[PDB]
Design a protein around this nucleic acid. Structure first.
Length: 580
DNA sequence: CCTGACTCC
DNA sequence: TGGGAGTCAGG
């Protein structure tokens, strides 16, 4: 805890070495158009703190930032890159990101500051961010000497930790996953976030006006059926109305009282019509609160764009998540909500939205990893996999599969991937549990490779302590041998599912890197706007659609070679809604 | 603040 | 007694 550094007034030459640890500090959680509060550089020649007002205005330092041959090691480089884009400055030459390194080594650690990564190698010459800045309403940037020491200690930690982290990744055969996948993807996500998605606010506002009217009508209908006014958005008050006033059967309880979940309310429809009304109301209410009001609150008014942040180092399976706003959960399943997508429009005139999605990628990945003959053959023939499972389960010819049979079979196919039990399947389908049990039993008799995979992967997790994905992502499962049934079972289901969900994440990430390269190689104006787990959304001039129609699906299908084909569907139109 | 509701994959 | 997420209002 005796670290010397130069609190510099101007930029000098020794600060611009061809290798440095760099800290560009953005304290606001949402880094879009957020202030840069300080800069630190550590390199061969010493340790330096710079004021942004000075440094970001100095052409030598800006030139260095954007010089791809001057290599930088950082933590959360995407944060810095985007904050710099808002200042009109390009960051290049990031060769090591400690956030992403820590994430690959163990996603469960929840590393989101340098001190937490430093903890993984018993390095303690740096403080947690929360300790320096404070929390909540107490959050503030400290006096310059305090800030400066903190930023320098973060840069110094990155400097000393790079090698130890690379050495462990290399031992895990994850070094290429960092350097050739996650780090390049970080730059692509930075582009997507900064570009943002344009919103038709006039349309959204009109939809909200109509929604408020409809909400009011449904609300009063509910109070009439209930015989009383109450807060419909209060599961507690609702529970009193349903299970005490109206005396409907209690199908499920939670730790706090009666359950009013959608699952339960659906099953109460034979008892009282009010439950269908309430379900409708809570749907409409979430549209209004989240996809109208919440969305309008984050639109930048001068440009009418929304700028999400894709968290690349959060999920336990290798997926991205999307926040403020979340653009990975925009409604699509009910037509009423799906219309929200009409408000998502191209950023330029005479441009269109192009959306491409993988068809059943998790089931194709399962087929591959399990090497199940019958499942692989189905995908090779492009037989409808839900129709196929229905024939095996119900033991009928293909022409005898009723749309209901297929419905149930779809539920089985998707449920197997999550380790669903017969209880869960029976409740999902609202069918006999004896029957649900036989469906699961027949499924595994029909796809014995899948059954072997499920057994083998749990045994592997118990023996190694972790499971792995196609591109070598890991997830540790220290609870897999717990003596407690609930704890152990949850970990076994994680063991089953994580290689599937995580490999699918690996594939779409590689596809984004390959797609970006191809777009840039052909000088297309098309660019990525969003990723939604198994879907990619782009915008482009209308002239480029013919090209994207061939290029995007091809790049996506060819991202990795499995034992079965990957299949991609695609559409385009004048709004996200119309790209269907 | 957590809990349970809604939304997506 | 179904894997992975985020946001919201109510309490």
């Amino acid at each position: 805890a005796k670290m010397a550094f130069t609190l510099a007034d101007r930029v000098t030459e020794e600060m611009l070495a061809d290798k440095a640890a760099l800290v560009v500090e953005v304290v606001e959680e949402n880094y879009h158009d957020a202030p840069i509060v300080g800069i630190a550089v550590v390199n061969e020649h010493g340790r330096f703190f710079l004021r942004p007002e000075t440094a970001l205005a100095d052409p030598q330092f800006v030139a260095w930032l954007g010089d791809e041959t001057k290599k930088k090691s950082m933590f959360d480089s995407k944060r810095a890159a985007v904050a710099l884009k808002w200042k009109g400055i390009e960051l290049c030459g990031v060769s090591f990101d400690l956030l992403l390194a820590a994430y690959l080594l163990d996603p469960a650690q929840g590393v989101d500051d340098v001190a937490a990564a430093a903890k993984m190698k018993q390095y303690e010459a740096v403080r947690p961010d929360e300790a320096v800045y404070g929390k909540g309403a107490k959050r503030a940037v400290p006096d310059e000497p305090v800030l400066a020491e903190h930023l320098v200690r973060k840069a110094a930690a990155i400097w000393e930790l790079e090698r130890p982290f690379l050495d462990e990744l290399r031992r895990n055969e994850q070094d290429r996953l960092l350097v050739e996948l996650e780090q390049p993807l970080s730059s692509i996500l930075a582009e997507m976030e900064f570009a943002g998605v344009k919103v038709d606010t006039k349309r959204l506002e009109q939809m909200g006006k109509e929604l408020a009217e409809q909400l009011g009508t449904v609300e009063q209908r509910i109070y009439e059926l209930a015989g009383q006014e109450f807060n419909i958005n209060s599961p507690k008050q609702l529970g009193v109305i349903l299970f005490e006033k109206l005396q409907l059967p209690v199908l499920k309880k939670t730790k706090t009282g009666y359950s009013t979940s959608a699952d339960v309310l659906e099953k109460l429809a034979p008892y009282h019509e009010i439950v269908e009304n309430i379900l409708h109301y809570r749907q409409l209410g979430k549209l209004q609160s989240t996809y109208i009001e919440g969305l309008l609150k984050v639109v930048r008014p001068a440009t009418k764009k929304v700028h999400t942040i894709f968290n690349q180092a959060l999920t336990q399976t290798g997926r991205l998540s999307s926040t403020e706003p979340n653009l990975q959960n925009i409604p699509i399943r009910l037509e009423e909500g799906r219309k929200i997508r009409q408000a998502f429009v191209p950023s330029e005139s005479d441009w269109l939205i192009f959306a491409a999605d993988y068809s059943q990628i998790e089931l194709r990945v399962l087929a591959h990893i399990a090497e199940d003959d019958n499942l692989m053959e189905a995908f090779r023939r492009d037989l409808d996999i839900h129709t196929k499972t229905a024939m095996d389960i119900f033991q009928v010819s293909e022409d005898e599969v009723t749309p209901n049979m297929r419905r149930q079979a779809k539920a089985v196919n998707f449920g197997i991937v999550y380790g669903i039990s017969d209880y869960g399947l029976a409740q999902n389908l609202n069918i006999s549990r004896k029957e649900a049990a036989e469906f699961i039993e027949r499924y595994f008799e029909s796809f014995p490779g899948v059954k072997r995979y499920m057994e083998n992967i749990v045994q592997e997790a118990k023996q190694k302590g972790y499971v792995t994905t196609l591109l070598h992502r890991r997830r540790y499962l220290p609870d897999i041998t717990s003596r407690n049934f609930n704890v152990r079972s949850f970990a076994e289901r994680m063991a089953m599912n994580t290689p599937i969900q995580g490999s699918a994440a690996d594939i779409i990430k590689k596809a984004m890197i390959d797609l970006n390269a191809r777009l840039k190689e052909e000088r297309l104006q098309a660019h990525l706007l969003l990723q939604v787990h198994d879907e990619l959304i782009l915008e482009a001039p209308k002239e480029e659609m013919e090209r994207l129609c061939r290029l995007v699906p091809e790049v996506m299908e060819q991202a990795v070679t499995l034992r079965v084909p990957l299949k991609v569907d695609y559409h385009y139109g004048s709004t996200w809604y119309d790209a269907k």
